[PDB]
Amino acid sequence: ACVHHIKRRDIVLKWELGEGAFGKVFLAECHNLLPEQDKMLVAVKALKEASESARQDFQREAELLTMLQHQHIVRFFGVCTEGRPLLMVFEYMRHRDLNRFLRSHGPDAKLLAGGEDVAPGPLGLGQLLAVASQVAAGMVYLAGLHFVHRDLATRNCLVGQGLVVKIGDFGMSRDIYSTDYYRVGGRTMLPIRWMPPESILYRKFTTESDVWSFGVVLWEIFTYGKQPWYQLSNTEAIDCITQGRELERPRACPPEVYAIMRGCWQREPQQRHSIKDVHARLQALAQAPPVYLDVL
Ligand SMILES: Cc1c2cc(cc1C(=O)Nc1cc(CN3CCN(C)CC3)cc(C3CC3)c1)OCCCCCCCNC(=O)c1ccc3ncc(n3n1)C#C2
Numbered sequence: 335a336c337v338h339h340i341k342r343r344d345i346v347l348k349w350e351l352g353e354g355a356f357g358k359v360f361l362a363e364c365h366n367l368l369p370e371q372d373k374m375l376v377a378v379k380a381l382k383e384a385s386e387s388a389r390q391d392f393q394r395e396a397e398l399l400t401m402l403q404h405q406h407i408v409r410f411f412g413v414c415t416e417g418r419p420l421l422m423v424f425e426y427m428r429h430r431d432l433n434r435f436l437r438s439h440g441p442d443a444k445l446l447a448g449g450e451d452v453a454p455g456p457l458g459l460g461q462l463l464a465v466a467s468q469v470a471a472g473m474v475y476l477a478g479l480h481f482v483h484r485d486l487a488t489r490n491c492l493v494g495q496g497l498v499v500k501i502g503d504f505g506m507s508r509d510i511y512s513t514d515y516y517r518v519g520g521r522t523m524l525p526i527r528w529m530p531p532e533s534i535l536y537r538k539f540t541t542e543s544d545v546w547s548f549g550v551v552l553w554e555i556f557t558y559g560k561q562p563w564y565q566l567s568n569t570e571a572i573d574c575i576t577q578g579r580e581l582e583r584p585r586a587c588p589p590e591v592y593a594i595m596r597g598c599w600q601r602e603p604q605q606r607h608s609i610k611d612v613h614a615r616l617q618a619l620a621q622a623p624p625v626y627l628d629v630l
Pocket residue numbers: 351352353354355356357358359377379395398399402407408424425426427428430483492501502503504505508
């Protein structure tokens with residue numbers, strides 16, 4: 335109802351960028367979208383099924399995405415519901431999702447990994463903190479709106495040119511991340527490795543469970559995208575989480591940044607730091623002078 339609409343003629347599909355079980359994303363030109371840019375590139379999502387349910391979920395995602403538009407939430411330009419197929423039009427983010435980006439600039443990266451956008455070699459402390467800070471700011475906004483994400487992970491963040499990082503949600507049906515979910519029969523899937531004890535045990539998801547998940551995202555960032563509890567099966571991960579075991583400090587993570595993770599991982603939800611306090615801490619370190627960060 336409140337969604338911006340884009341005329342079908344104004345969208346010109348170029349080629350497929352990627353897909354999940356239920357959706358495909360295309361690169362496209364979109365014209366008369368932004369005035370200063372007669373023709374810009376966008377990412378266009380189309381459904382891979384019809385009849386009723388997914389079309390409801392389409393307009394659900396649309397109204398939600400419009401409501402949640404903010405500087406570090408994925409940018410949504412609107413819909414094309416003029417006939418079929420139904421299309422959702424997103425800002426194009428060249429470096430794709432944050433987990434891919436992290437893995438392609440990890441401990442073994444060298445000169446080749448550098449580009450117009452990012453330095454060669456492994457992402458430096460300054461850059462890792464800048465990424466962490468942007469994700470935290472997005473979570474601050476969502477906590478402000480009392481939106482509970484429930485699947486916060488680097489795989490669900492996008493990275494654009496300039497290394498602008500924004501929080502999205504691709505659902506749980508990309509083959510490449512099937513391993514990041516524990517499938518409970520037909521119920522269906524849970525990102526247990528990112529979930530706090532009270533979510534695993536009591537099936538409660540709150541703003542405080544999101545702070546825990548952000549703690550795990552912070553860990554992902556400083557391990558350059560490796561899966562949490564990678565050494566464990568799903569049931570062994572559930573055992574470890576519920577019994578209070580904690581992810582170890584990443585090699586690239588200074589003790590002070592680890593203190594922030596652990597503050598997200600307080601067993602009792604009310605004892606966890608607020609996301610706004612986490613963001614404040616991370617932004618300070620992100621913006622701190624090289625002289626300070628070099629001995630951090
Ligand atoms: C950006 C994006 C693209 C493609 C998508 C989805 C999204 C997205 O974030 N949507 C989204 C939805 C909600 C609602 N939410 C709540 C309840 N949930 C249970 C469900 C849904 C909330 C939020 C904000 C967190 C508040 C964001 O759908 C397609 C998924 C299929 C796999 C993706 C194909 C691989 N992607 C690419 O190949 C690619 C490459 C470049 C690029 N630039 C922009 C995009 N993009 N994509 C996009 C998108």
